Write a protein that binds this ligand. Structure first.
Ligand SMILES: CC(C)NC(=O)Nc1ccc(C(=O)N[C@@H]2c3cccc(O)c3C[C@@H]2C(=O)O)cc1
Length: 167
């Protein structure tokens, strides 16, 4: 038993809810919140910008030190940093950005990072300003992630379409 509430169960291990991931992290305080990161950990907009704003820019400060030490992530890769006031940990995961021409097949590799964590609060990778089809992203998620994932979908219209179109 865990504290995630009001989710619709899609499969054995994937759950979805129309919710603002920032508000959901502040309320649940999950072990892991997933950020929709880029390789530079520049949290400017979309989910990343929102999560970072909610940390009063502490996420960005920590991220800049990480990059200065380690260099950029790989598309499809991830790193674990602090969750600040939102979670114990933040898993920064880099899905491909279609608006940069990145290979959509890397979306499966991106979701594989979730399997290193028993339970996660997450957005749909590569959705939103990353330019991929969220229906495709949800399918890859369900077909790749084996651990327990609670997906927060900000847009109600998209959530309903994601739900009604789900096989
Ligand atoms: C009010 C404050 C305290 N909170 C806050 O600013 N929160 C927040 C901001 C932006 C996003 C976001 O960019 N969402 C994306 C979005 C939008 C429309 C269609 C989509 O396919 C997607 C994918 C992705 C998602 O929904 O995961 C999420 C939360």
């Amino acid at each position: 038993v865990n504290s995630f509430s009001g989710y619709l169960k899609l499969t054995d291990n994937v759950y979805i809810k129309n919710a603002d991931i920032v508000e959901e992290a502040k309320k649940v305080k999950p072990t892991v919140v997933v950020n929709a990161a880029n390789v530079y950990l520049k949290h400017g907009g979309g989910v990343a910008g929102a999560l970072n704003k909610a940390t009063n820019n502490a996420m960005q400060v920590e991220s800049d030190d990480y990059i200065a030490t380690n260099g950029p992530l790989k598309v499809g890769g991830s790193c674990v940093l602090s969750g600040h006031n939102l979670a114990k940990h933040c898993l920064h995961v880099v899905g491909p950005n279609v608006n940069k021409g990145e290979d959509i097949q890397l979306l499966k590799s991106a979701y594989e990072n979730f399997n290193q964590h028993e339970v996660l609060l997450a957005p749909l990778l590569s959705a939103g300003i990353f330019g991929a089809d969220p229906i495709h992203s949800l399918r890859v998620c369900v077909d790749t992630v084996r651990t327990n994932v609670y997906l927060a979908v900000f847009d109600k219209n998209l959530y309903d379409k994601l739900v009604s179109s789900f096989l």
